[PDB]
Amino acid sequence: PFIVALDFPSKQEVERFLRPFAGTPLFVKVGMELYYQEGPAIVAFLKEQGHAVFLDLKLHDIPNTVKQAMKGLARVGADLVNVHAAGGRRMMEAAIEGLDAGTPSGRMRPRCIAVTQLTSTDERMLHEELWISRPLVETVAHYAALAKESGLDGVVCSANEAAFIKERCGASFLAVTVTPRKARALGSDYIVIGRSLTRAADPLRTYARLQHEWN
Amino acid sequence: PFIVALDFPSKQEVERFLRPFAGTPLFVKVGMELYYQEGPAIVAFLKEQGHAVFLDLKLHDIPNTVKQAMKGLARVGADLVNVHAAGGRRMMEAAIEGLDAGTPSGRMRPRCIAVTQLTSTDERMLHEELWISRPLVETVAHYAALAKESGLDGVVCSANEAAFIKERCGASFLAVTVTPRKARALGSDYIVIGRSLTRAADPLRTYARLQHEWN
């Protein structure tokens, strides 16, 4: 249920933070700052350590490009990827094809969720800048539906946004997102952990604590 | 004036095509399919060869993330990067900061242009899927205006779209995009060359032809 955001400025420190987890597998997130500096090598490392990877690059391009890229991210070793719903139904559908195409027969393709509206986008922005004329809340549900219709597995959403989306898309539509306890109460499926864990003095015990608050 | 899209499935194939240009510097584009499989090393290679590099990754994320990622792409040696205007003025302004922060003093930061509406997005998609209520053309100029307001140097646009853009943003706002000669008459600053060059049996001769037709 936990996705540890490896928001570190180098492979050096990533490696350092993960040392105690050499015996405790984790579901980790690789953002675009780290991936653009380390390349596919960082995923190989994480995979070797035995961790599952969420390659968070938010692909948003034309259908065929996202497809070939997703095919490549499958080959790389990602367990979860994401895209912008703003990319359109066609692009999202092509992303899924790319994943199956880069996934060996029998085995399961890497999960793929969609960004609806970034957590940093407020009403004023949706209104004046993006020129979308429907409340932020409805716009998020719409994009989430678009993603569900396109064959995606879920979406990235604010904790108190999860119930609304699941009501619209089905309770099996993943909600990746406050207290782990609160997060769980709001309907999220996965919680993205940041400094809370990555900057703790006792990472292994903090992680155990984390699982207990959620339980 | 020419930006060669290195749309090849592998680094070997890329190095194979560029061999004859070992003595003829080019402005090349690295898409997300190639960059996500070769990482920052492919840029180093291109840089070693003496080519300028357009890292076309269309970053679209929260402000701080794009900023840290741009600082990194500058360190990687990118001469031109891009972003989605859909990310908002704040994210776009943050991209410029990251680029400056990753550029040595006295040196020039790498250029940054924005995607307004992907060339693969049609009227129906903008209407039904995105929730944007203004015509496609007006939304494009708007987003371009948004990018100009943010400090970006230009945008990616259709050949027959640059006149409208420059009229709205200023003749100095770059238009990166039909025949070379045609693309020129339509107001574009740069034309992305595809298979017509990368799959030419006589690339050096062909390259000379393009420059002549443009001239």
UniProtKB/Swiss-Prot annotation, chains A, B:
Pathway(s) per entry: Pyrimidine metabolism; UMP biosynthesis via de novo pathway; UMP from orotate: step 2/2
Alphabetized InterPro entries for the sequence: Aldolase_TIM, OMPdecase, OMPdecase_AS, OMPdecase_bac, OMPdeCOase_dom, RibuloseP-bd_barrel
EC number(s) per entry: 4.1.1.23
Domain of life, per lineage: Bacteria
Keyword terms: Decarboxylase, Lyase, Pyrimidine biosynthesis
PROSITE patterns according to UniProt: OMPDECASE
GO MF term list: orotidine-5'-phosphate decarboxylase activity
Record-listed substrate binding positions: 7, 29, 56-65, 119, 194-195
GO biological process: 'de novo' pyrimidine nucleobase biosynthetic process; 'de novo' UMP biosynthetic process
SUPFAM superfamilies: Ribulose-phoshate binding barrel (SSF51366)
GO cellular component, one term: cytosol
Residues at the active site: K58
Record-linked Gene3D superfamilies: Aldolase class I
Keyword Flavoprotein among UniProt keywords: no
Catalytic activity: orotidine 5'-phosphate + H(+) = UMP + CO2
Protein's job: Catalyzes the decarboxylation of orotidine 5'-monophosphate (OMP) to uridine 5'-monophosphate (UMP).
Family from the record: Belongs to the OMP decarboxylase family. Type 1 subfamily.
Oligomeric form and interacting partners: Homodimer.
Protein name as it appears in the record: Orotidine 5'-phosphate decarboxylase
Originating species: Geobacillus kaustophilus (strain HTA426)
Gene: pyrF
